[PDB]
RNA sequence: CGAAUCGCCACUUCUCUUAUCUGGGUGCUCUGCCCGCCCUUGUCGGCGCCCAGUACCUUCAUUUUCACAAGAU
RNA sequence: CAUAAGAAUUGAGGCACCAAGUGGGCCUUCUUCGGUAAGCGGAGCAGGCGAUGCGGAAUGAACCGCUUAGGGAUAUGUGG
RNA sequence: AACGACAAUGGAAGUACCUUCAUUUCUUUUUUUUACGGCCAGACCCAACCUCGCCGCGCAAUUUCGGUUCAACAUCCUUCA
């Protein structure tokens, strides 16, 4: 056996984080967002109590070394939601057949596809919030936003997968409801 | 030792089995609980395939007589232990007849003692503390295994009362702490009292 | 045992010949020990060895009685574990002991009554000449024998 | 309060490799020992299995206070050498086996006839 | 909280070699699982190389050069007095005691036990507060029962007439007591 | 290291007793062999090949065990030839810093065994040398070369049952991993 | 008498032919939550805090602690 | 019979009378033929099996170890 | 008053039960168990199997850059060499 070791966490600034357990509890502007990690524990060492946290390893295996990054980033992104949130833009896109999506709020209702077939419905999970916006030339547009990209995204990606089609060629297929901007709610501090 | 009850929270399945196997063999009625936290290696996929395949067989004419699959977490283990025991030994059988396991934990019986686990059977201790692994209940869930939900409930209760108890002890134990003290260094000196270095 | 040796030798022999007309002793003891009687009639009980009767055979033991509950007795060494504790029995006489006394066909007897008592006395001063065969801890008094576990070969003392 | 000065042990098995077991020589693992050197001390010593007789009440004899009686009967044998780090000891009888299922049963390990 | 870092000039515990529990300090780490260790003990520990599996770091870390000399070591580590500091560590008790325990004798033992016996019935239960606290089940209960026997005495079973009869009974116990001892 | 597995002997030998070689000319190795029986076999063997000479004709004067410097690590470089894979001689260069060259040879051999799968005959270990610069090549030796190299490490053993106390019957007390 | 299932425990002792029970939870990442902290703030090093671990009960009332009657029949 | 230099053995050798029982083999390291092949066929050497069991290879005629009075006590074998 | 997971009888082994045989026997006799020259084996405890020779060690020395520190310098030496 060859030493990686295990441990905990890297850091930036204005947002509190757990620093303890498998679980990072990140707290900032937009609240607090927290995740529990499995085998993802790794050479921590606090560099400042409040001001510097890293986890950038001593020895171990190849596979180990990757994770370290993947770990920071994601929790960084825990910070991101907590700070500047996520805002996904989607637009329904269709040409031969018009397509309509509303938002119940608690759930998203999707109409029309190909004359409509089934009604695609997605319940609005927590903090992915959904807006059909339309003025300002907001346009066939859904907006998913909240302070967890992964969720905002997951729900989103899910949506792209909710607008799938089969049988009788991608070379005539396009139409569906596609991701148009995955972002933050804004720039924020 | 009498009336034995072992706590299987986080114990390496095979090893624990085997270990027990010898124990049973050397003859003693022993008991397992926290059986649901008995452990299986790696992935549920892996655990399933194995079980599935096990479950899958038949005794073709009368499939009702090849192997049966009491899918309790207990039953898994124990049967393993039977497997690790020599079944058809008339002696082992009696041995079996001795052996006790309940899934989960029927409560009242752990309270002045019960601190008991068994050597090698400590799953992290056995498993590399960085290798992946999967939990028994999870398996039994995977093959259904009915009571899981219930079991949960039951567990929560168990903890509570135990906590209740525990708080109570907590109180006395300070008194118990408070056990002298005072005149107690007037332990001797002739023929070399170092009770002061010994237990005091 | 103990130190530097080939001992007790004298520039003429390795070599031969044992006990003519003197008893051989238990190849590890010295009198005046505290023994704990292992088996039979008084198993677990704390008594004192006086001497092994005339012939190669058996230690006379006594606790004295009130410390212990010890009747004095012929015993074999290989029925006792021999303490590290030791006293002189210099004042004790133990002179008369002869095993015929100990035949139960010859065992209560006045002889017994006197002799143990005599003996007991002798022990007693010696014991008092070095405390805590009785005092407290006994030695001799105890109740408790062997706890489950750490058996004698682990009991170094 | 009592005797209790032998260790319960359990008579495990006959010596063995594969086709060839030794009914003549039996194994006990002596509680708290499993410590072969330690066991070396124990060597020779005579071990007892006391059983109760179930059956027909015998004690032919009187011994015991006299007219001994019992239906409880008890077997002695002696230990031959330890093995295993975990202190197996092998044991021999002056006779031949200790019943024929007293195996697995718990058994008593005296510490004397004494060698101190 | 993973923390007793090996740091050359760290004090490590010999855990299962025969050479267990002598002491010495890191004079090298020879890599993965091995150490180079040194002490002033005249006979064990010289400069040994020992397996890391076998060692426990003792939370005395000094400064000293990585890879180093006895002579330097002997004195600075003497100066560090960490042996002593380690000596004062509690962990230590039972095991230096263990060696002792091996070699006691009975009387000692009895006392040693007796110490706690002395306390036992004598300084916890005993008294009066904490035995007005838990108390022992019988106490607790006797007290509690006494509220539930405010029930007889005080209350809604019992004792305004029948205890008067109890008074009759009480003497009756004594009437027999007196009689029975008088035969 | 030092589980001192393998031994080191120096063999010094000579060609022909025969005046057909009046005056043989002498050979040396310090060689890691686990005994001298081997050692001399090996010695002879290159002599039987590399030098073409049968042992049974010629004469080893001496085979004598050869000792390392002292008490501390020196940085060894190792050079290797292995013949296997049904494809003969192949070379490798590897790096160990320890206190013993022997331990290095040793460690190589397992290492090859584990690590290139190999088997011992089939290797001729060419050489081991203490490396002086701050290099010392290999990343792992360099890795742990650091002044102020130090560490954290956790999560393993001590034998859980045992005769040094105590098998199945455990635990009397309560659990975690312990440290 | 110089070993000899022994006389106990015990048809109301039994998971068993001879310690009570020291009890509950959790992670490796902690020897007390331990903790907390400080500090070239590191791999840390130092300091601090608390009682809490410092596994752990063996029954006369003792045997903190004098001590005493009684074996042998 | 020395060399000054180069055996070991030799639990006898010599030597013979006369009668049985056998002639389908089969298995193997090694060499090797036929044919794609074949647990195939077909030879060469040695060894087995056959015609033996014991101990080893969860299972095996021939693989491993090893052969056998009857035991006892001990230690090994292969193998764990 | 014998027994039964289910092969069946089978070996071997011991116990239980036995209907059991034959033998020997104590107020100077038998019986199980301790114990015992010289023996007659096996295991523990300390001594040493030598020795020429390096090895090194020390010193200095060159090369030789590393830990300290925020890093450089000290500290050309942490040290390998």
From TrEMBL, chain A:
PROSITE patterns: RIBOSOMAL_L6_2. GO terms for biological process: cytoplasmic translation; ribosome biogenesis; translation. Residues 11-85, 97-176 form the Large ribosomal subunit protein uL6 alpha-beta domain. Keywords: Ribonucleoprotein, Ribosomal protein. One of its GO terms (molecular function) is rRNA binding. GO terms for cellular component: cytoplasm; cytosolic large ribosomal subunit; nucleolus; ribosome. The keyword Ribonucleoprotein applies. It holds the Pfam family Ribosomal_L6. Signal peptide: none annotated. Belongs to the universal ribosomal protein uL6 family. This is 60S ribosomal protein L9, putative. The lineage of its organism: Eukaryota, Discoba, Euglenozoa, Kinetoplastea, Metakinetoplastina.
UniProtKB/TrEMBL annotation, chain C:
Pfam families: Ribosomal_L6e. SUPFAM superfamilies: Translation proteins SH3-like domain (SSF50104). InterPro entries: 60S_ribosomal_eL6, Rib_uL2_dom2, Ribosomal_eL6_KOW, Translation_prot_SH3-like_sf. One of its GO terms (cellular component) is cytoplasm. GO terms for molecular function: phosphate ion binding; RNA binding; structural constituent of ribosome. The keyword Ribosomal protein applies. Residues 1-24 are annotated as: Disordered. CDD domains: KOW_RPL6. Keywords: Ribonucleoprotein, Ribosomal protein. GO terms for biological process: cytoplasmic translation; translation. Belongs to the eukaryotic ribosomal protein eL6 family. PANTHER family: 60S RIBOSOMAL PROTEIN L6, LARGE RIBOSOMAL SUBUNIT PROTEIN EL6. This is 60S ribosomal protein L6, putative.
TrEMBL record, chain D:
Coiled coil: none annotated. One of its GO terms (cellular component) is cytosolic large ribosomal subunit. It comes from the Eukaryota. GO terms for molecular function: structural constituent of ribosome. The keyword Ribonucleoprotein applies. Keywords: Ribonucleoprotein, Ribosomal protein. One of its GO terms (biological process) is ribosomal large subunit biogenesis. The keyword Coiled coil does not apply. Belongs to the eukaryotic ribosomal protein eL33 family. This is 60S ribosomal protein L35A, putative. The gene is Tb04.1H19.150.
Automatic annotation (TrEMBL), chain F:
SUPFAM superfamilies: RplX-like. InterPro entries: Ribosomal_eL20 (IPR028877), Ribosomal_eL20_dom (IPR023573), Ribosomal_eL20_eukaryotes (IPR021138). One of its GO terms (cellular component) is nucleolus. It comes from the Eukaryota. Keywords: Ribonucleoprotein, Ribosomal protein. One of its GO terms (molecular function) is structural constituent of ribosome. GO terms for biological process: cytoplasmic translation; translation. Residues 7-129 form the Large ribosomal subunit protein eL20 domain. Belongs to the eukaryotic ribosomal protein eL20 family. HAMAP family: Ribosomal_eL20. This is 60S ribosomal protein L18a. The lineage of its organism: Eukaryota, Discoba, Euglenozoa, Kinetoplastea, Metakinetoplastina.
């Amino acid at each position: 056996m060859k030493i990686k070791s295990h441990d905990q966490i890297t850091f930036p600034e204005d947002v509190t984080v757990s620093v303890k357990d498998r679980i990072v509890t990140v707290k900032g502007k937009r609240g607090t967002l927290t995740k529990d990690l499995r085998h993802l524990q790794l050479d921590f060492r606090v560099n400042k109590k409040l001001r510097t946290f890293t986890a950038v390893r001593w020895f171990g295996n190849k596979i180990n070394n990757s994770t370290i990054n993947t770990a920071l980033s994601h929790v960084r992104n825990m910070i991101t939601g907590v700070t500047k949130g996520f805002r996904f833009k989607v637009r329904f896109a269709y040409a031969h057949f018009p397509i309509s999506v509303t938002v119940e709020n608690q759930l998203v209702e999707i109409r029309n596809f190909l004359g409509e077939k089934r009604v695609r419905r997605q319940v609005v999970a927590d903090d992915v919030k959904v807006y059909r916006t339309d003025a300002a030339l907001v346009k066939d547009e859904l907006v998913l936003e909240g302070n967890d990209l992964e969720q905002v995204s997951r729900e989103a990606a899910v949506m792209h997968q909710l607008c799938l089609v089969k049988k009788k060629d991608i070379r005539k297929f396009l139409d569906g409801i596609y991701v148009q901007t995955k972002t933050n709610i804004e720039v924020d501090e | 030792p009498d009336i034995i009850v072992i706590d299987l929270k986080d114990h390496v399945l095979g090893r624990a089995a085997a270990i027990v196997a010898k124990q049973l063999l050397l003859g003693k009625k022993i008991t397992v609980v926290r059986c649901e936290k008995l452990t299986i290696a790696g992935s549920e996929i892996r655990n399933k395939i194995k079980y599935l395949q096990f479950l899958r067989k038949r005794k073709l004419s009368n499939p009702k007589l090849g192997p049966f699959h009491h899918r309790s977490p207990s039953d898994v283990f124990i049967r393993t232990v039977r497997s690790m025991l020599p079944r058809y030994t008339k002696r082992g059988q009696r041995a079996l007849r001795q052996l006790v396991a309940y899934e989960g934990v029927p409560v009242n019986v752990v309270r002045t003692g019960g601190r008991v686990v068994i050597p090698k059977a400590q799953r992290h201790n056995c498993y590399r503390n960085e290798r992946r692994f999967t939990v028994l209940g999870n398996m039994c869930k995977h093959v259904g295994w009915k009571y899981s939900d219930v079991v949960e409930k039951l567990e929560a209760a168990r903890i509570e009362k135990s906590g209740r108890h525990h708080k109570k002890m907590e109180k006395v134990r300070v008194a118990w702490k408070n056990a002298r003290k005072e005149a107690l260094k007037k332990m001797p000196q002739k023929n070399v009292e170092v009770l002061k270095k010994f237990g005091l | 045992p103990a130190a530097t040796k080939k001992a007790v030798e004298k520039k003429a022999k390795k070599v031969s010949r044992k006990s003519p007309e003197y008893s051989t002793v238990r190849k590890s003891c010295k009198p005046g020990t505290i023994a704990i009687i292992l088996a039979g009639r008084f198993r677990g009980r704390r008594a004192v060895i006086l001497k092994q009767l005339p012939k190669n055979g058996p230690l006379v033991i006594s606790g004295p009685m009130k410390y212990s509950g010890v009747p004095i007795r012929r015993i074999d060494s290989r029925y006792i574990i021999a303490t590290s504790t030791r006293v002189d029995l210099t004042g004790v006489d133990t002179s008369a002991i002869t095993p015929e006394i100990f035949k139960r066909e010859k065992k209560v007897s006045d002889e017994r009554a006197q002799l143990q008592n005599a003996i007991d006395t002798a022990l007693i001063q010696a014991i008092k000449k070095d405390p805590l065969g009785k005092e407290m801890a006994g030695y001799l008094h105890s109740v408790f024998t062997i706890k489950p576990g750490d058996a004698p070969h682990r009991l170094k003392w | 309060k009592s005797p209790r000065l032998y260790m319960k042990g359990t008579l495990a098995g006959y010596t063995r490799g594969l086709h060839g077991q030794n009914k003549n020589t039996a194994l006990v693992r002596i509680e708290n020992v499993n410590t072969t050197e330690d066991a070396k001390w124990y060597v020779g010593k005579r071990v007892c299995y006391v059983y109760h007789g179930y059956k027909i009440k015998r004690c032919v004899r009187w011994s015991k206070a006299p007219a001994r009686r019992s239906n409880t009967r008890a077997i002695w044998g002696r230990i031959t050498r330890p093995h295993g780090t975990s202190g197996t000891v092998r044991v021999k009888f002056n006779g031949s086996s200790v019943p024929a299922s007293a195996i697995g049963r718990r058994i008593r390990v005296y510490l004397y006839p004494s060698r101190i | 909280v993973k923390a007793n870092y090996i740091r050359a000039g760290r004090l490590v515990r010999i855990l299962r070699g025969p050479r267990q529990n002598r002491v010495g300090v890191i004079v090298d780490i020879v890599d993965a699982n091995r150490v180079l260790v040194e002490n002033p003990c005249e006979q064990k520990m010289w400069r040994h190389v020992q397996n890391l599996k076998n060692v426990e770091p003792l939370k005395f870390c000094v400064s000293i050069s990585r890879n180093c000399s006895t002579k330097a070591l002997k004195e600075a580590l003497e100066s560090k007095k960490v042996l002593e500091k380690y000596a004062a560590t509690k962990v230590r008790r039972p095991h230096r005691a263990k060696k002792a325990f091996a070699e006691s004798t009975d009387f000692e033992r009895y006392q040693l036990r007796v110490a706690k016996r002395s306390r036992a019935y004598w300084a916890r239960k005993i008294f009066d507060e904490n035995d007005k606290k838990n108390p022992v089940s019988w106490h607790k209960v006797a007290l509690k029962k006494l509220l539930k026997n405010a029930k007889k005495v005080d209350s809604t079973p019992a004792a305004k007439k029948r205890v008067e009869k109890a008074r009759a009974a009480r003497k009756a116990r004594l009437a027999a007591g007196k009689s029975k001892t008088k035969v | 290291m030092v589980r001192p597995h393998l031994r080191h002997y120096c063999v010094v030998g000579r060609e022909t007793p025969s005046e057909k070689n009046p005056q043989p000319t002498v050979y040396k190795f310090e060689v890691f062999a686990p005994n001298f029986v081997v050692a001399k076999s090996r010695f002879w063997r290159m002599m039987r090949e590399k030098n073409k000479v049968k042992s049974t004709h010629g004469d080893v004067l001496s085979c004598k065990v050869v000792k390392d410097r002292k008490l501390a690590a020196r940085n060894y470089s190792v050079d290797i030839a292995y013949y296997s894979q049904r494809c003969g001689y192949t070379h490798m260069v590897k790096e160990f810093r320890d206190v013993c060259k022997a331990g290095a040879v040793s460690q190589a051999y397992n290492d090859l065994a584990s690590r290139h799968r190999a088997r011992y005959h089939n290797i001729e270990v060419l050489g081991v040398k203490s490396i002086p610069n701050h290099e010392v090549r290999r990343l792992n030796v360099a890795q742990f070369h650091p002044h102020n190299l130090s560490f954290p490490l956790l999560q393993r053993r001590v034998k859980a049952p045992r005769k040094d106390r105590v098998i199945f019957v455990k635990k009397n007390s309560k659990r975690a991993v312990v440290a």
